[PDB]
Amino acid sequence: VTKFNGLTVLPPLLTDEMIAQY
Amino acid sequence: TLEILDITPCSFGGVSVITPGTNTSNQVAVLYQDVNCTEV
Ligand SMILES: *[C@@H]1O[C@H](CO)[C@@H](O[C@@H]2O[C@H](CO)[C@@H](O)[C@H](O)[C@H]2NC(C)=O)[C@H](O)[C@H]1NC(C)=O
Ligand SMILES: *[C@@H]1O[C@H](CO[C@@H]2O[C@@H](C)[C@@H](O)[C@@H](O)[C@@H]2O)[C@@H](O)[C@H](O)[C@H]1NC(C)=O
């Protein structure tokens, strides 16, 4: 599975490693 | 001068205020979103 005009991409709260732990 | 200059926009980001309820305390912790700590 595969700018700077005020647009932001917030990060998820559960990182992919923590999801893998779940 | 025949030289090439890249232009990067000046840093910006949202400001969030992490706060326990005013009913409990009044200290706050300010999160500056997506800015390296030096730039503040
Ligand atoms: C703040 O400074 C830079 C910019 O965000 C980061 O650390 C540098 O990252 C660059 C990669 O773009 C490296 O080439 C440098 O070697 C890194 N260190 C320095 C001192 O420039 C990081 O975000 C933050 N680093 C520090 C030390 O606060
Ligand atoms: C809101 O707080 C009320 C009393 O708070 C008191 O004062 C603050 C500064 C703290 O020291 C706290 O520990 C004290 O109890 C109470 O009605 C209750 O704790 C809270 N009620 C609601 C609805 O949030």
* C-alpha dihedral sign at A21, A12, B22, B39: positive
Q: Burial, B32: exposed, middle or buried (Cβ in 10 Å; 0-12, 13-18, 19+)?
A: middle
- Determine the residue type at A6: G
**Structure-token pair, residue B11:** 């840093």
Nearest CA to ligand 2 atom 1: B23
Largest CA distance in chain B: 62
Which resolution, in Å, applies to this structure? Answer: 3.2
- Separation of alpha carbons A20 and A1, rounded Å: 17
What's the Cα-to-Cα distance from B19 to each of A3, B29, B31, B33, B40, rounded to whole Å?
31, 7, 11, 16, 20
Rounded CA-CA distance B33/B13 in Å is 5
Q: How was this structure determined?
A: cryo-EM
Under 8 Å CB pairs connecting chains A and B tally to 7
**B30 with B15: CB under 8 angstroms?**
yes
B39: amino acid identity, one letter: E
CB-CB under 8 Å, A10 with B33: yes
Which chain B residues touch A10 with a CB distance below 8 Å? 33
Q: Looking at beta carbons, which residues of chain B come within 8 Å of A8?
A: 13-14, 33-34
CA distance B10 to B39: 10
**Whole-angstrom distance, CA of residue B40 vs CA of residue B26:** 23
